[PDB]
Design a binder for these strands. Sequence first.
DNA 1: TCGAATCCTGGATC
DNA 2: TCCAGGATTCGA
Length: 1118
Amino acid sequence: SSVSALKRLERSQWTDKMDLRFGFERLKEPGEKTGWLINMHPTEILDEDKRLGSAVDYYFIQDDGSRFKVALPYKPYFYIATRKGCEREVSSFLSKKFQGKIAKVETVPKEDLDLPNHLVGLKRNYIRLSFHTVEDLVKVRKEISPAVKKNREQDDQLDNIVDMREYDVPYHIRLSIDLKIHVAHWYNVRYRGNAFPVEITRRDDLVERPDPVVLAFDIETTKLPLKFPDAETDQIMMISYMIDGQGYLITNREIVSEDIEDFEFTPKPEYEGPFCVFNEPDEAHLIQRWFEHVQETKPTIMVTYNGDFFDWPFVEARAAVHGLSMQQEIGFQKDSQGEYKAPQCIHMDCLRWVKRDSYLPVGSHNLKAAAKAKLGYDPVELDPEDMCRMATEQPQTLATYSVSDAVATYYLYMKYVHPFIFALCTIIPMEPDEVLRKGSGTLCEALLMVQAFHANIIFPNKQEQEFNKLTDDGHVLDSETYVGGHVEALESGVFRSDIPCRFRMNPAAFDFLLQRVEKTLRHALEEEEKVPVEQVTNFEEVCDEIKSKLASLKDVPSRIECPLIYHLDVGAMYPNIILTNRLQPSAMVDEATCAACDFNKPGANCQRKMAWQWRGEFMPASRSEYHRIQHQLESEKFPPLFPEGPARAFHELSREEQAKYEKRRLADYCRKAYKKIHITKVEERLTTICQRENSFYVDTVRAFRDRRYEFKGLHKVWKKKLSAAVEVGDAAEVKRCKNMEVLYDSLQLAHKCILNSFYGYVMRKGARWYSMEMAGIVCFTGANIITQARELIEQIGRPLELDTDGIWCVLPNSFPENFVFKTTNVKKPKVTISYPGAMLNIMVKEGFTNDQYQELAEPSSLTYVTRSENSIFFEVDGPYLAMILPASKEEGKKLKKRYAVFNEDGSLAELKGFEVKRRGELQLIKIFQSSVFEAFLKGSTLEEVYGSVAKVADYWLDVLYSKAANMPDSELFELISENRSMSRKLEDYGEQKSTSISTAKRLAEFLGDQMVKDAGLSCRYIISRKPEGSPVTERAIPLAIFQAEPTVRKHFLRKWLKSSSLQDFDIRAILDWDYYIERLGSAIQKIITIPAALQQVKNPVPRVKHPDWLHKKLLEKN
DNA sequence: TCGAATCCTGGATC
DNA sequence: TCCAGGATTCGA
Ligand code: SF4
Ligand SMILES: [Ca+2]
Ligand SMILES: [Ca+2]
């Protein structure tokens, strides 16, 4: 043990050595200082007793650039529950058995929601243990746990213990829960003296943040063609980085042919990017220079793109090959999980954010796309085959490109990432890098821990999984879930305001609507505006206008008119449903508990009942067969799980793995006795939601909603003030206002993120508070509101798309759109009401809203007040200029989430179910799809619209038919060459065949087995015609031949084509033109020609066929 | 004997 | 985590 003690002392002094090297002095004598808290880590530290105790370090910074550490001791503790009344005796045993390890043992009561009648006000006692250091927590936990399990299964001193809680919350999270310390607050701290603990006080007085120094860097390398770079053979060729708006470029002068000299590269006036240049004799000097410059400038935040996965290891290895050990110089080291970390400097990252939080569509996560979308400029791109060629022949081009990764990533990080992470971190205890790396579901739980602590409620355990659970009829389940909602495109076609369409609508629906018109607007005034009608003079005039319009619609229900395109959606519908229904993760009970609760008496109104749908997939075998298989596995002993030990009885093996053995043996049996692979069943259930259970969760959600709207209000105010400051042009005031604007906007984005996270936690596996019921009841209710909405609209008009959060709709031009009301209250001189929204809002107010909410009046009397509430509230959008949907090639199948939309300006408002870039798709489709949508806006009637957009396809088709005769072949290659790359060794497949594989075998044949050796072969192929009839996995030809010497080409082509008599080899002879013309067909048929036949227009492109089902349906309908 | 279903592989650094 | 594309497997 002493060897571990001295090892952890060694690492402690090593960290303090680094901190002194990076200027983080300690506090050493009594005094007070004010500082901003940037980071914290746990550490073991000595005290006056020379014992070793667990502690936490806090790192503070000051406006003057000074920095300091402080450290605080704190003792872990965890709770245990004895059998009734045994507390003293068991505590006497614990104190006897673990004297010298237990720091203290104590009795305390707690609130515990599962306790019978607990709402009457009962409580239970728990013992609290505590220890001098986190190791003894482990040692005691490991010894107590099995007695806990034994006593659980069976139901002496350990036999008395019954339950145990709260033994796995991280120690440094524990400390921030208990002592209310969060980072990016300002603090004042008093060191009273080494005899005494420090004391820390919040200073919310100070709002303005300091500026940390930030460093961003990237490296570029040699590598062999068609391969990933090799840490053992390749050499770093240059490294480039930004510090706080300044750029430096270090060149490995051995390779780069010329002495680079300084230059400037600005993407835009907002991005200056001046750059300074250094030349170093060789890679060892470049790495020395960089390790010197970092240790000089002492950066505090490092930032990099994907840097954990590629960029760090390549530096670490080459430094080690020169003996310049990374970890001693900078400090960065690989953690247990595989992330590079350091004690004094935080490794921020982008791609974790681009994934988790940035709302960007899949496959557009490439840096260059993110630069286009959020930064809005054209980065430069160059084919990684050429790197060495430029280095030999044209260095300035390689510099010019290679700086443009740094100048992009630094500004992206500063502008978008930095105020988001340091906003979100203000409300969570975890460290910044945990908050970035950790999955968002865990943040919701950590946040809920704070409230559960302040409410004095003891945590539940993590949810235990069951093995091979059974239905009552003994079907072993394989899957179980709530019935999810659905997405469906109802119709396909092209819709635009300019193009009249035919409508049919039921007149009786209008004779219902016109009865309620005043009531409708009254509601919009009374509930939504909170401006009583008595504050308006002309309320009657617009009501009679509306009634005249409704009458004019009623007179002629079937008509042709221009369309109005509206989008209807509900903001944050699921939180609103939670707030409305008082759903909580512990509100459910079985009726067996209301049998106990004294509040169960005649005419009580605490029971709310609601319904949800459940789905299961399970095997047909029943209780006998499963129990017989279990007895089979008991009667015959297993082999050892692997042949490194003796045979095992069933009690001597991993139970969870035995669950897989049982599953496999059932799957092997079933086909003898039964004749179905899966049975899938759906069912509907209802559950009593206790309406006056403790409320802290809903109170949290409501608080977050209200704070969200507060910060939106302040952001609007500060944006106006910023416009005023920028008009004035006073640089200090401009700075102050812009700082406030960023701080408020980041805070509102952070709360938006948390709010959206509050739903996604409840379904998570293993999480502390969990119930699929609450996940189901919300989701099923989220369908009724949408279905009843269409149950209205489909009588008025036509819905085009139905989606999880809203619908897309089209209404006759004659419909009442919006109005303004002449207020008397000059506080708000005019109000505008959108009638199509207000007409919907009252429906959901009437049907859905809760009228049996309850709230506590008095803790000593438990008098309760009944109430009603609602917050479900539709929002309207647009109206939009145009919308387009595709159609499926196959009959009888429905698209999802795939369409385009255009705003009244004519610019794209949306384009979804597609993307403008992919690494796995050939160029021709990408160009074609882009050009067709931009053409669809042209023309003025449907026959003109299709007559115009046909002109792109009838271009490309003749490009192919004319063999691209006039096109340069370099363009031809770029137009038709696929792309792929292999992430595995060829040995790891054994045998299988696909086009992605065959090219690698052929490249090996061409270059030798050098290509085989490892993962990361990059390959480019085209599909040949000549070997007729074989599957397409055969005919793939790698491009690299066509660069090679003629006779070598002839020799290998005659082989792979199986033609000893071909006498031409120019690519035009070889290409299987028919394949490409077909696959372009398989795109055009999904956009232009099927929809037109589905929208009463004759085929606009005769050179491509319809499928036979449509051809017959056309003939039979004609 | 043909059609429907199943499973496989990649994207994200260079 | 999600979809396209291709081939094999399974059923009438
Ligand atoms: S709903 Fe009423 S009777 Fe049922 S457990 Fe809750 S408080 Fe008791
Ligand atoms: Ca790069
Ligand atoms: Ca990189």
